[PDB]
Amino acid sequence: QPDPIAADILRKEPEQETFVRLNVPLEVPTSDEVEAYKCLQECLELRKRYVFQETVAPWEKEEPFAHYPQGKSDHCFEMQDGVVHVFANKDAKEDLFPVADATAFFTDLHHVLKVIAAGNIRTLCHRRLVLLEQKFNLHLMLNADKEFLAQKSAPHRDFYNVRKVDTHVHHSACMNQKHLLRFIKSKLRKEPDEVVIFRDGTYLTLREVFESLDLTGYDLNVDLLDVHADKSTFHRFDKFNLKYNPCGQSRLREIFLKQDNLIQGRFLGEITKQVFSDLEASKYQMAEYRISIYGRKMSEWDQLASWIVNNDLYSENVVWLIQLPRLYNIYKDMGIVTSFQNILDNIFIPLFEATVDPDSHPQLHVFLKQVVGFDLVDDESKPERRPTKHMPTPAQWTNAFNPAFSYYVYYCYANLYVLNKLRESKGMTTITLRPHSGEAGDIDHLAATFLTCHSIAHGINLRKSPVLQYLYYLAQIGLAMSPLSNNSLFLDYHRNPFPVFFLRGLNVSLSTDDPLQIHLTKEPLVEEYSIAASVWKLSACDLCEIARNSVYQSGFSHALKSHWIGKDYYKRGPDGNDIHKTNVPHIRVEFRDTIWKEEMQQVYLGKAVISDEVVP
Amino acid sequence: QPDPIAADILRKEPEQETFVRLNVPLEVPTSDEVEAYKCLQECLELRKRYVFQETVAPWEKEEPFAHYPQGKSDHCFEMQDGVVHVFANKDAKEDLFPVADATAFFTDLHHVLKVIAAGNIRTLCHRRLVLLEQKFNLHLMLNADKEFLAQKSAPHRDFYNVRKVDTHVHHSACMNQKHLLRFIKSKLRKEPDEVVIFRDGTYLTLREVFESLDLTGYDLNVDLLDVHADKSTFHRFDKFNLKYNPCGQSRLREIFLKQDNLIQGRFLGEITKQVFSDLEASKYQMAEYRISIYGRKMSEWDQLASWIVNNDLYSENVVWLIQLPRLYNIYKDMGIVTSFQNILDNIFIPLFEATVDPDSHPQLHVFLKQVVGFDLVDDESKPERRPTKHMPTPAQWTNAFNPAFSYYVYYCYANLYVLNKLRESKGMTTITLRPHSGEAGDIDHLAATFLTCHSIAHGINLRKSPVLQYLYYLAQIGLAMSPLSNNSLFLDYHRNPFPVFFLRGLNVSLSTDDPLQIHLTKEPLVEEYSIAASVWKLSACDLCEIARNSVYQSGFSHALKSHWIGKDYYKRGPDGNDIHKTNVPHIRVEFRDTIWKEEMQQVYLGKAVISDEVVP
């Protein structure tokens, strides 16, 4: 079928839906290089024996948004070697005895990294991926209309109706210029002489700052009109720094697009709100906004938390992921930090503290019941010495350079982890590791990412490794991709792997990134889905399949998933999707669940794991 | 450069704009087959000595929206052979002695139709078109950045800011389902028991009609849920009939998407309004909504007129074109008409009458000062006997079949014409012939269209005739194209000629057609420009160049053109575009004006027409 934008009007009385279609059996035996599949098994296990997961899952669960007293003690943190330890409430000598040490995770990483580029396995996986594609195509050739029509039995639900989530957005870029601009243009007119910032000697009003930069008012525009502390002074304003680097920042940008500024945030916040309202307008578009924490100051956490509250920043549709930019090397010139450790300390303690004693870090709590995952960033392509095994602890790391990627995630994993396996303990919300990974850079980012995280933000590079791509299939790791953005720098649009990763059944989702820089419409991400559908030729069952599993990839409450997709959603497979609220043919997912079940069987060579429920 | 969606942030102080760039001279002499160029000349002249144009143009021009008395007599219509005559106010014997007769226009048509497919000319034109492309590309290779940057001197203006016009939209399809639906869904809830229609025996309420069709309410959806007078009764509901055919029409459709229905329009109108309001919201998107008149009943005109008024249907941004569906053959089974003539009579008299005596057809007037052009339609591919020269008058045409295309436009031209050369006379607004042509069907549609009309709606078929395509270049005929729609039936997206017609400098524009069926966003046509920009790789200078000349193609007041583009807009060439309100490099259009000037010179072999002002 492919491409709904066009699709003409038709008919119908289907008032009783239909599974059933062409089944395609194949099966294939096996060669001596089963000792490959074996290798996959390991990597497949490893990941499992690692990525943390809540011992008791959401669906097995037993006015405003803030306050309420708690108090309950329970103690000790005791962070040893970048990996916190939290010993038994009193004082133990074993602790909540979890997590695998740094080295190990590095040696397992090499392990994956071997198999990953080992000759014959690269071959088998390629053969199996492309083989995966074909089948889906063949299937399309036999059943696209069977799928088209099923959708007609759920008269109500069509594209709009289905709730789709912007699984990868950076809060800040989340606004359309026409709006943003007009926000500014206005708050100038209707309030010039209002102190805003204090740079170069005195506090300036608004009118000041502007005439100060000169080029201002009716001339203002999103483009480079964030022209600075202002001068000749040197700062590169590529793009990552323009959002990832806290300092050397411009003037309007410090005023309007940040929170740790002077007027506390009265303007960024203020903007967010009208974002949310219009968000809550179209009812179906959700958002997993990325918010930062550099880990230079212990405050940042509470500091940010309070930003949320004091501004009443909450929506049903929005949740948050904390993004820590991997910029230590900058924070080590600026002398504000002395050894990597300091950072683990600025993010993995201000929380932990808040977990043991809620009230020691109140309205940080009311925030964390809204935080859903920890995303780490920066230009993936900056060069790096890929970590060995005998690797310097986090507090032996004083040297001038930024620690590698792998290194980042690791300590960013354990902590996250050992902290998670307690907020769980105490019955509080938990955060998931959802790294930006594989957008550029080295292949190992993914390898490591594969061993330790939930979702992922990019995956563009899975395209250069049959093997990792194949695992991610099996494992069903889920990718939140922004084609339209990826198209900016790193990759031509038409050369982007999404559609292909989609055909082969990888857990892909379409995201947005920077709607400010990127889109032309009032409705950002729909517009994504829409140009996507058109260049790649996608049907609705296709978009709907995408939007649907955007949600599975999401971090919202069971209460809302159930209501959005189905009360049976926790079920592995077809019997787990209510087309009346999903609009995707029981037959598309049955095809998908059975081709996957098949592959799994191929690799656990008859002796498969199975599981009858999805996962978190 | 190509593709703005991505484009990263940069800088700048350009506060003094720059023409200047790589000029590329070529020149070429000529062969004996100059007697080709000659042939072009003729066709080029012919068109000229035909398409009507206002002896005194808009820029040389010397609260609510309705009323005011006039009265002034002036008389006689006297339509001879489908071609009205309007003799001197009193009683003459020569009339306002204009227009060329039917035959002639048919023999000139053959003439064009010969040269058009004559061997060596097809060759020369292909060679010259593709040669046209190259140059533009080369130019892009030498100056894209020169163009990128110029745009940075007009800080203010970027894509949004620039006013773009939806030069081809069918009123009715102009709404997004989510809205349309919710309109309905609601007016059910908040007002069931309200008579709406009287079909099958009695007048039904709303609740009735619905439960009458059964499938209703929370189940309603744009798709085929226009299920009829209802039964087994046979009616094809492809798509053209679903909007072009007045009868055999459904129930909700008769209620909500039409005006000549029972509750007068209280619902279609009512809907339009909130379309306009939101239209007037985004300030920059205009609309040239198509509205129909079948010409079965003399009333239709006044009948419609009054629909506009009594509902206060006016916007700065919207104007109208009357679309008459070429369905005589249906109206000749239905016995409601006896010979083609009757139709010329139902559209070219209810107006004419209104021109001589304004007050004999008041608030028809207040309407026509808003009508801007006459668009005629239907499935272009339906087969047809392409008209000869000795051709049956309009009132000798009683036979069972629909008259050919050519035939339609002809009599639809003269009338339009001879009427135009009087509403002008009396100082009243005039209407332009803006046919839907060359979307499918035979090549001659365009040939004829080329000889007699202003803009055009499709042009997809210029792609199969070097020659017509080349004329349309020279002449600068302007095409209002809907790729996204054309993609539905007639043509794959990626195989659509637009981008190419754009490269070669044809007067192209991006349109919408049926935003109801077609788009996924709140903002229809921007979304067009946006998927276009992305699959074809267009820069902003590119879109802006497009949006800009969408307006040149438009039918609005000089008062608004000037304000939207520039007060010098009437000027042929570069010195005629104010980048500060157009955002397109004086250098892009200088390139375009000079390559055209060049080609013209090639064909009028040194002895060129010239003109220092555009045209209407």
Ligand SMILES: O=P(O)(O)OC[C@H]1O[C@@H](n2cnc3c2N=CNC[C@H]3O)[C@H](O)[C@@H]1O
């Ligand atoms: O494209 P502008 O509006 O000048 O800003 C881009 C910012 O948004 C985020 N962003 C945009 N695109 C991406 C982003 N995030 C991570 N890396 C690559 C990709 O995800 C970046 O953090 C970056 O600081």
Ligand SMILES: O=P(O)(O)OC[C@H]1O[C@@H](n2cnc3c2N=CNC[C@H]3O)[C@H](O)[C@@H]1O
């Ligand atoms: O695609 P739907 O919403 O079921 O209705 C299509 C209608 O909109 C107009 N339309 C759509 N697409 C086009 C149209 N007009 C002329 N012909 C081809 C093209 O312009 C047609 O008049 C047609 O009746």
Ligand SMILES: [Zn+2]
């Ligand atoms: Zn990102």
Ligand SMILES: [Zn+2]
């Ligand atoms: Zn049309």
